[PDB]
Amino acid sequence: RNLRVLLDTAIPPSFCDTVSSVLLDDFNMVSLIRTSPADSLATIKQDNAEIDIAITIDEELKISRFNQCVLGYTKAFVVAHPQHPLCNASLHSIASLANYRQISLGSRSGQHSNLLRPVSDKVLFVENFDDMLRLVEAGVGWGIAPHYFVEERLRNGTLAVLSELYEPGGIDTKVYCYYNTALESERSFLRFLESARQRLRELGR
Amino acid sequence: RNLRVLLDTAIPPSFCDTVSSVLLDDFNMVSLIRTSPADSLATIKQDNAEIDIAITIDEELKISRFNQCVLGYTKAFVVAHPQHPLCNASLHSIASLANYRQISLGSRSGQHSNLLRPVSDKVLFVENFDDMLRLVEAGVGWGIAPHYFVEERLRNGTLAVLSELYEPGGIDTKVYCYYNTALESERSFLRFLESARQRLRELGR
Ligand SMILES: Nc1cc(NCCCc2ccc(F)cc2)cc(C(F)(F)F)n1
Ligand SMILES: Nc1cc(NCCCc2ccc(F)cc2)cc(C(F)(F)F)n1
Numbered sequence: 001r002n003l004r005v006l007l008d009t010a011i012p013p014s015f016c017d018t019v020s021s022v023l024l025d026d027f028n029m030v031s032l033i034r035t036s037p038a039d040s041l042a043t044i045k046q047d048n049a050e051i052d053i054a055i056t057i058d059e060e061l062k063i064s065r066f067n068q069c070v071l072g073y074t075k076a077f078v079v080a081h082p083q084h085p086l087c088n089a090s091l092h093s094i095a096s097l098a099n100y101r102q103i104s105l106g107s108r109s110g111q112h113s114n115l116l117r118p119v120s121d122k123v124l125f126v127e128n129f130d131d132m133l134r135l136v137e138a139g140v141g142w143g144i145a146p147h148y149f150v151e152e153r154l155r156n157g158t159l160a161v162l163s164e165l166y167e168p169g170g171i172d173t174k175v176y177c178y179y180n181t182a183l184e185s186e187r188s189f190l191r192f193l194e195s196a197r198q199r200l201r202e203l204g205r
Numbered sequence: 206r207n208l209r210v211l212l213d214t215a216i217p218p219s220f221c222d223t224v225s226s227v228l229l230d231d232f233n234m235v236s237l238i239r240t241s242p243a244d245s246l247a248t249i250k251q252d253n254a255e256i257d258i259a260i261t262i263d264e265e266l267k268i269s270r271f272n273q274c275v276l277g278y279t280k281a282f283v284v285a286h287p288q289h290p291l292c293n294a295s296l297h298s299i300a301s302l303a304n305y306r307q308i309s310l311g312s313r314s315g316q317h318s319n320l321l322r323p324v325s326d327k328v329l330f331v332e333n334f335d336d337m338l339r340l341v342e343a344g345v346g347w348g349i350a351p352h353y354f355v356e357e358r359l360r361n362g363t364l365a366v367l368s369e370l371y372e373p374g375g376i377d378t379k380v381y382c383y384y385n386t387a388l389e390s391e392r393s394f395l396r397f398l399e400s401a402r403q404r405l406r407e408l409g410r
Contacts, residue, residue: 061319067300070372091389095272114266114319167275168402172379184296197373 002029006044006054008037009129011175012074012148014203019055022195026188036128038107038116044178053189054178059115067184069193071177072200075170078163079133079150080142089162097162101141103132133159144171207234211249211259213242214334216380217279217353219408224260227400231393241333243312243321249383258394259383264320272389274398276382277405280375283368284338284355285347294367302367306346308337338364349376 005023007016016032023030033051035043040056043049044066055071078097080086086093086100097119104118106125112118124141126132132143133150137158147170153159163171183189210228212221221237228235238256240248245261248254249271260276283302285291291298291305302324309323311330317323329346331337337348338355342363352375358364368376388394 061322061324062303067296069296069299069370070376073377091272091274091395094274095386095389098267117266119266165274165398171275172278172377174377181300184300190296193370 002031003027004031004033004050004052006033006035006040006051006056008035008040008056008058010037010057010074010076010146010173011055012146014148015055015072015074015175015200018196018199018203022192022199025195026191036105036107038105038112039109041113041178042107042109052180052183055175056178057115057173057175058113059174059176060113063178065181066178067181069177069179071175071193071197072204074173074175075147076144076173077147077150077154077161077170078142078144078166079136079153079159080162081137081139082157082160084139084142084160084162086142086162087160089160089164091165094162094166097142103135103141103143105129105132146173207236208232209236209238209255209257211238211240211245211256211261213240213245213261213263215242215262215279215281215351215378216260217351219353220260220277220279220380220405223401223404223408227397227404230400231396241310241312243310243317244314246318246383247312247314257385257388260380261383262320262378262380263318264379264381265318268383270386271383272386274382274384276380276398276402277409279378279380280352281349281378282352282355282359282366282375283347283349283371284341284358284364285367286342286344287362287365289344289347289365289367291347291367292365294365294369296370299367299371302347308340308346308348310334310337351378 037056037058040054041058041060044051044054100120101122102118102120103124106127129145129149133145136143150159242261242263245259246263246265249256249259305325306327307323307325308329311332334350334354338350341348355364
């Protein structure tokens with residue numbers, strides 16, 4: 001039947017291309033759906049959503065009808081205006097992120113997970129990463145965005161990284177694959193998982 | 206003054222050697238202390254402990270008087286007796302870990318974090334990884350142990366890996382460094398962090 005897949009907006013396009021191309025080798029109908037990382041898990045837990053697979057970075061221990069595995073790894077950076085008060089990016093600043101305003105992703109359910117829940121008390125929720133960085137470039141507050149979403153801005157100087165001393169080279173973020181328990185026995189899914197994983201390791205190095 | 210450092214038993218010896226050697230370049234008195242990963246964070250939060258640094262894998266968002274950063278990455282494997290009912294290591298088995306008995310690390314406080322809290326309902330707590338693997342080799346139940354603690358047993362066939370399809374090559378586990386806020390301004394700590402991180406990246410590749 002039709003296979004409904006969910007890819008949050010934190011998944012790099014290279015991951016999206018690999019997932020889409022591999023799925024087409026096995027399945028004959030695939031529905032790709034984009035969502036916010038803060039709304040990914042909340043969506044699959046909706047019975048009426050009938051989501052079969054969900055590629056997202058949000059982490060949750062046990063979800064009914066779904067099993068969790070790891071597909072690959074991506075990077076994420078704490079970014080702010082180049083003239084933000086925390087531009088020194090020292091250790092005292094990284095600890096003081098809880099005191100400044102954060103531009104975090106808002107969840108339709110209003111509740112977040114430990115991974116995506118904002119760190120500071122002053123928070124300004126949004127719906128996507130474009131609205132986030134639009135406010136970050138304005139100096140309103142700092143945020144967390146994937147690498148591919150800020151690589152252009154970093155080289156253009158319009159943004160700066162603040163999380164280099166927390167985790168050099170970026171904040172390694174796992175990309176999970178939540179798949180309905182019904183798929184654990186179908187070889188079609190196993191072929192996709194092994195191929196997508198292998199193609200991602202090749203693209204990783 | 207004296208610098209008290211905490212390294213849980215999940216830190217590979219190569220990490221311990223690098224941390225110890227680097228600290229000696231800056232500080233003139235260092236007290237290295239070992240603890241269980243399930244007791245690491247609970248220890249630093251004791252005011253009477255006077256811990257200055259804690260190298261552990263246990264993760265906690267915000268801890269008073271302490272700041273969190275990333276030192277490196279290690280591997281961890283789900284292991285079981287080679288003749289365990291879940292020896293097939295397929296996808297249906299990885300999901301059924303919640304049904305079988307787990308040999309997890311017991312915390313002195315009785316409470317665990319999302320990372321270290323057991324997944325299954327049938328749990329048998331212990332105090333260290335030696336007691337864990339001693340029971341795992343007996344077929345009593347499965348457990349989670351670092352790579353260096355099971356590399357010998359895997360090659361000898363006395364143990365088997367079950368988490369290969371969850372995350373190929375092992376479960377990447379971040380190694381955090383919780384340091385007292387007082388150290389964020391002392392160049393001695395910055396030199397240690399940069400050197401230990403750089404020496405770990407060199408040993409990583
Ligand atoms: N909120 C959020 C969270 C992510 N994990 C990393 C969070 C851990 C963290 C937070 C603040 C720090 F100073 C240092 C580390 C990723 C993303 C992503 F990738 F979507 F941008 N967003
Ligand atoms: N309890 C515990 C937890 C660790 N994180 C990884 C847990 C995530 C997980 C659990 C069960 C699975 F089937 C697959 C993944 C590491 C360690 C270590 F490294 F100390 F052995 N222990």
